[PDB]
A = this chain, B = another copy of it.
């Protein structure tokens, strides 16, 4: 049969990595009726009901159905150590509470070495050149590849989704477009990645010519 449905989502990596953005794990109840609502979240963190569970209102959805979201503020360390977080919801529509649990990719890590390729000499024929940031064999999928210029960000880049290599490690190529005028003047462009297997969770190489 059917009823309300729960979706447990992990923190977005840039939050958990880099101590400056609190990391939250959002629990989303969906298809929650208007008659028969009142959803009760029973949060669990490695065996502790943890009553800092901050929930939210009843969201208004085209399909009349309601949608409730509750964010639990997490710790940067407790996520990475491997504590298992867990949502348990009940509603008079559910004849047995629906519980689902998550806890970060539990598997043996690896380091991402960050190599940085340059434009091909023919591309310098085009109107804008493409700078490549290679990120070889790492673990796990979560990662934060980003480009920067001189001082602050560059947002003219598109990054390949993580691929699975022959050994079981994840590589990914980011790429960023730039004015041939801007690349030939000699501005230095730095590629910064953030993974849970890099001391201080932050390596960053640089490219020029």
Contacts and interface: CB of A to CB of B under 8 A. Distances in A.
Q: How large is the interface on A (under 10, 10 to 19, 20 to 34, 35 or more residues)?
A: 20 to 34
Contacts of A160: 160-161, 163, 172-173
A122 B206 CA distance: 12
Contacts of A173: 132, 160, 173, 175
Interface stretch (A19-27, A43-51, A112-120): A112-120
Secondary structure dominating the interface of A? strand
Q: Copies of this chain, how many?
A: 2
B136 A117 contact: no
Interface string A132-173: 101010000000000000000000101111011110000111
Nearest to A129: B115
Given A115-B122, A158-B163, A159-B163, 17 more contacts: A113-B123, A115-B119, A117-B117, A117-B118, A117-B132, A130-B134, A130-B136, A132-B132, A132-B134, A134-B175, A136-B175, A156-B166, A158-B165, A160-B160, A161-B163, A165-B175, A171-B175
